[PDB]
Structure formats: structure tokens, C-alpha cells
């Protein structure tokens, strides 16, 4: 863990915008 | 249009100088120190000095003044940018900013200064490029600088493609002594530590209010940043055309975007201070802090600095939660809290004596500021949509990012 907010996985783009 | 840029010391001795144009004699640096002393003593001291017809702009560094003498009316903003770039390059190459490293890496320092700018025109500004061409422990110049893509060095190979993002939030609240907050601005910071193989072209996507309105999805929580500044690698053409954040990420940690917009929400911490100071008899510190943030968020390492009297002594603290320590150097009491859960209410009651002899002159009323930092909290509600990582070879990236909320200019005017 790490203070200041744990790292989270990020997507590649908005899948709902086509 | 600075004639020459030099690095000085606190005693007036120049740590290092590098002439670029030669239109100003090197002996003018000696008169800079007396001029600075006179200006400080007379209140006329300014970063842009002027020795007759030659201006010696100086910037206060960690240990020395970065004096950049100039002769004509050159670009002052350009000179400041060059000085900032030089400071950043020195910080990257040298981990310490003091006289110890100035006299320890002079052999490489001279080469770096020569390569940085010539004839008053800066030429090299990439710290990685400078390290790939100038080292303290030479080959031909890299082709990345000659090529257009100077923010992503080609040929980088990594075992894994991991990017460490950081959603840094700065909450600045200017609360007047009357209880009304005047300056309430929140500045975002999208800094990513990209460490992958090659030079992937980042395709940034977030829940922006402008982007949602353009795409017709302007109905959810979209962050409308008043000021958004792209990084060096960010392509401004795509952003101007359709807000397309397409750019080559740098090799390492860099700030791609930095949101900056006003805040119209209630403060995360509501602090009520009481000054029950007797007339040279005793002092009362009725400090009450209310956490206006969500209860699910905890403020780690909360340090609410309450300025105590300059001549106050023998203080007694009557608080409920959080350690209170009076720092003689700081001349104030800091309400240190390890973890501050949202909605927490801390009450403090200070009591200390005062000297019998009255003070000769007043000391002013510095504002009270807190050092709260609660991560994993997105007050602005801006959610990143996706990060378009595109590679010609083709690889599966696993980027990571963390949202950190801290207290910036959260200063409350004293009563």
C-alpha cells in the first residue's frame, strides 16, 4: 500500500463513445 | 538577452559563471552584492537588478543567487524560463542544491552550461538528452533532439510497461478573518510516471465537462477546469481541434496536464479559532476544527498550524484529539494529527502566560493554515475515462494512477 491513494488500473478510452 | 548567467553564493562569492555574449564585463558581479544589500535594507530589492545600463537579474536559489547579467532589453520571460530550466537540470543531475555540489561537479557543469545555451539563446533543454550527451562519470549528439520527437527517446526497451499516474489535488482556501472565504481555487495535477518499452503515444481520456458536452454526454459529473495546461509532449493541435490529448509520454515521471479552476464547494475542514488573550496576563486558544469532508475519507498527517504569541511562554494545551506541539523556531502551535477521519470534530483549549514587559513593536497577524493531506479522495469528481497507449510493435500496458488530495493555500485569516 501507499499513502495518498492506491494506484488503480486505467482503461484505454471511453468504450461507450464508440 | 542576458549577457552572462552565473551562479553565486550566500557570501557574495560566485560559485560558477558562464559568459554567453561577452557584452558585459565579469567584474559587474561584485557590485551586485552591495546593491542587493542596499535594496534589502531599503525595501527596493527585486529579482531583476540593474547596475547602470546593465541589468543583473538574480533568483534566490536553495543556497546561491542565480544572477544573470544582461545588457539590452532582452526577453525577461525568456531569461526566467532559461534560469528555471537550468535549475531543473541541476536538480536532476545533482540531488543537492548547495555549495557542496557546485564545487564537486564543475568539470561536467561547465560542459552542461556550454551545451545548454550559446550567444544568449538556449539550445538544450531536455534533462534526459543532456544526460545522454553530457555525463559526470563523449559520443555524437542523440538524434532525438535533431528529430521532432524530443519528448520521447526512441529505442527504449523495458521488461514491463508500467505507468504510475498521480492525481494530485491542491485545495487552496483563502478564508478571511470575518469568516468568508475569498480565494477558493482547486488546482489539478495529472502527473504520470510512464516506464515502458519504446515511445508510446498517450491518448488521454477523462470525464471533462467540455468533452462530455461536445460528445453529448454533458449530464454526468464532468470536471470543468478553468485552466488546463498541456505538457511538452502533449499535442496542442488535437486539443484545440477536438480536445484530443494525443502526445508521446516521456521516459519517467512528468506532468502531462494540470487542471486549475475555482471551487464553489464547502471547505473540507472547518476550523474555528478563539483568541482569549489577556492584556499581558494570559492567552486563550479556543481552536475548534470540523471536518467538512466525507466521513469515508481520512486526512493523513493533518497539521493545522495555529500561530502562537511571539513572546508567549509557559503554554498549556487542553485538546481532545491530535498532538499539539509548540515549536520555538516556528513560534506557533501546530495541531498535528496522524489520521483525521471525515466529519471529525477536534476542540483545543490553549492557555499560556505573557511577559510583564509590553512589546516594543507589533508582530502582525499571520494567517492560520493546515497541512491536511487525505488521499484516495476525488473532490472534483473528475473521472479518467481511458489512456490510449498505442505502440507500433504492439504490447499490453498496465498503467496505474492514484488520486491524492492535499491542502494547498488553505490559509484562514487571523482574528
Amino acid at each position: 500500500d501507499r499513502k495518498g491513494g492506491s494506484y488503480s488500473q486505467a482503461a484505454g478510452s471511453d468504450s461507450a463513445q464508440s | 538577452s542576458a549577457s552572462a548567467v552565473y551562479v553565486l553564493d550566500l557570501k557574495g562569492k560566485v560559485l560558477i559563471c558562464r559568459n554567453y555574449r561577452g557584452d558585459v564585463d565579469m567584474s559587474e558581479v561584485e557590485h551586485f552584492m552591495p546593491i542587493l544589500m542596499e535594496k534589502e535594507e531599503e525595501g527596493m530589492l527585486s529579482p531583476i537588478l540593474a547596475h547602470g545600463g546593465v541589468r543583473f537579474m538574480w533568483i534566490k536559489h536553495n543556497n546561491l543567487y542565480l544572477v544573470a547579467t544582461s545588457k539590452k532589453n532582452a526577453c525577461v520571460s525568456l531569461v526566467f524560463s532559461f534560469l528555471y530550466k537550468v535549475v531543473q537540470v541541476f536538480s536532476e543531475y545533482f540531488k543537492e542544491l548547495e555549495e557542496e555540489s557546485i564545487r564537486d561537479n564543475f568539470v561536467i557543469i561547465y560542459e552542461l552550461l556550454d551545451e545548454l545555451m550559446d550567444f544568449g539563446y538556449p539550445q538544450t533543454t531536455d534533462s534526459k538528452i543532456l544526460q545522454e550527451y553530457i555525463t559526470q562519470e563523449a559520443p555524437r549528439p542523440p538524434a532525438t533532439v535533431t528529430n521532432a520527437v524530443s519528448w520521447r527517446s526512441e529505442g527504449i526497451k523495458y521488461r514491463k510497461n508500467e505507468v504510475f499516474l498521480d492525481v494530485i489535488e491542491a485545495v487552496n482556501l483563502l478564508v478571511s478573518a470575518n469568516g468568508n472565504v475569498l480565494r477558493s481555487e482547486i488546482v489539478g495535477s495529472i502527473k504520470m510516471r510512464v516506464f515502458l518499452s519504446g515511445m508510446p503515444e498517450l491518448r488521454l481520456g477523462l470525464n471533462d465537462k467540455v468533452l462530455f458536452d461536445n460528445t453529448g454526454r454533458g449530464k454526468s459529473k464532468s470536471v470543468e477546469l478553468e485552466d488546463v495546461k498541456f505538457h511538452q509532449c502533449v499535442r496542442l493541435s488535437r486539443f484545440e481541434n477536438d480536445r484530443t490529448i494525443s502526445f508521446i509520454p516521456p521516459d519517467g515521471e512528468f506532468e502531462l496536464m494540470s487542471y486549475r479552476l475555482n471551487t464553489h464547494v464547502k471547505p473540507l475542514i472547518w476550523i474555528e479559532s478563539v483568541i482569549e488573550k489577556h492584556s499581558h496576563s494570559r492567552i486563550e486558544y479556543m481552536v475548534k476544527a470540523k471536518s467538512q469532508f466525507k466521513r469515508r475519507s481520512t486526512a493523513n498527517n493533518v497539521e493545522i498550524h495555529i500561530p502562537v504569541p511571539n513572546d508567549a511562554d509557559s503554554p498549556k494545551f487542553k485538546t481532545t484529539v491530535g498532538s499539539v506541539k509548540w515549536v520555538p523556531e516556528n513560534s506557533e502551535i501546530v495541531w498535528s494529527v496522524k489520521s483525521f477521519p471525515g466529519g471529525k470534530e477536534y476542540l483545543m483549549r490553549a492557555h499560556f502566560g505573557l511577559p510583564s514587559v509590553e512589546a516594543e513593536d507589533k508582530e502582525g497577524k499571520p494567517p492560520i493554515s493546515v497541512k491536511f493531506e487525505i488521499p484516495y479522495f476525488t473532490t472534483s469528481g473528475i473521472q479518467v475515462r481511458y489512456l490510449k497507449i498505442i505502440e507500433k510493435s504492439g504490447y499490453q500496458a498496465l498503467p496505474w494512477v492514484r488520486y491524492i488530495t492535499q491542502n494547498g493555500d488553505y490559509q484562514l485569516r487571523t482574528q
Partner: protein, 177 residues
């Protein structure tokens, strides 16, 4: 001290020459008038080491105005270095040529400036533009005689966009002056 430094500089040991150069730079950086040793360092100038060449060029630039008469023994070295295959060496030589405030020194460097005007390296092109701008600032009549205005104008209409920007800045400075 001075005699020992001169003896070390007059030796055939590369490590000793490097140590003497470092000591001279430290004395020069510390505030020691090392201009009297410039003629001694003139002989120990043509060196294969890139670090030594940079230090020698810096000393010559800092000892050029002090000893303009003694600076006449560096034209051959500059001419030889102007054809160095390494782009960094060529850029350093171009920077040193324009940094020498010698009235009779820039006259012999006109041919190297013309040769380096068409440098293919964008860094080389930027260095050539900077040297041309420095020569024009030092001698506007010399720059006009050399006819670098035509080359400078066509520089913006070339590749190496950073080199194009450097040439544009040089042309603006020439027109500004």
C-alpha cells in the same frame, strides 16, 4: 605551484595533463588569474580527449581577450577541428570560434563558417547559425562581406525545425541590430 603546473602541462602524460587542466580550471573558477599560463596551454591543445578539448577551449575563450597576441596560435587547431567527424566536436568548435573576441581571429574563420553553413546535422546547423550571428554582432561589415544573409534566409525554409528556429532568432537579432 605555477612552475610545477607548467612542468606538468609540458609533460607527455595524459593523466598529468588532465590533472593540470582540472587544477587550472579550479584556480580559474576559484578566482586565480591563470591567463599567464595560456601560452603554455597553447601547445597542449590538439588532444584526442573530448573533455580536454572543452577545457582548453574554455580557457582560450577566457584567455582570448586577456592575451589577444598569444591567441594567434589557435587558428590552425580550430581549422583542423572544423572538419571533425563527431558532430559534438564540430558544434564545440563553432561555439568557441564565435566566443573568441579577437578582431583578427574571426577573419581567418570565415572559410570554416562558410563550410559549416551547410552542415547537415541540425545541431551543426544551429551551431553554424549561432557562430554567424556572433560574427555579425562582432563585425557586421564582416558578416555582410561573408554574405551569410542569403544562407540565413534559406535556413528557415529547411528541415531541422529547431535549427530553423535558431536561424530565425539569429536573423531577427541581425535585423534587430
Amino acid at each position: 605551484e605555477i612552475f610545477e603546473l607548467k612542468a606538468e602541462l609540458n609533460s607527455d602524460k595524459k593523466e598529468k595533463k588532465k590533472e593540470a587542466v582540472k587544477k587550472v580550471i579550479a584556480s580559474m573558477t576559484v578566482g586565480k588569474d591563470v591567463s599567464a599560463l595560456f601560452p603554455d596551454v597553447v601547445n597542449c591543445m590538439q588532444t584526442d580527449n573530448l573533455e580536454l578539448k572543452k577545457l582548453v577551449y574554455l580557457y582560450l575563450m577566457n584567455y582570448a581577450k586577456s592575451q589577444p597576441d598569444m591567441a594567434i596560435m589557435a587558428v590552425n587547431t580550430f581549422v583542423k577541428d572544423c572538419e571533425d567527424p563527431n558532430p559534438l566536436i564540430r558544434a564545440l568548435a563553432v561555439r568557441t570560434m564565435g566566443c573568441i573576441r579577437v578582431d583578427k581571429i574571426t577573419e581567418y574563420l570565415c572559410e570554416p563558417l562558410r563550410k559549416c553553413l551547410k552542415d547537415e546535422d541540425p545541431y551543426v546547423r544551429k551551431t553554424a547559425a549561432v557562430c554567424v550571428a556572433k560574427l555579425h554582432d562582432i563585425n557586421a561589415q564582416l558578416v555582410e562581406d561573408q554574405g551569410f544573409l542569403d544562407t540565413l534566409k534559406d535556413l528557415i525554409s529547411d528541415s531541422n525545425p529547431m535549427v530553423v528556429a535558431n536561424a530565425v532568432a539569429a536573423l531577427s537579432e541581425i535585423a534587430e541590430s
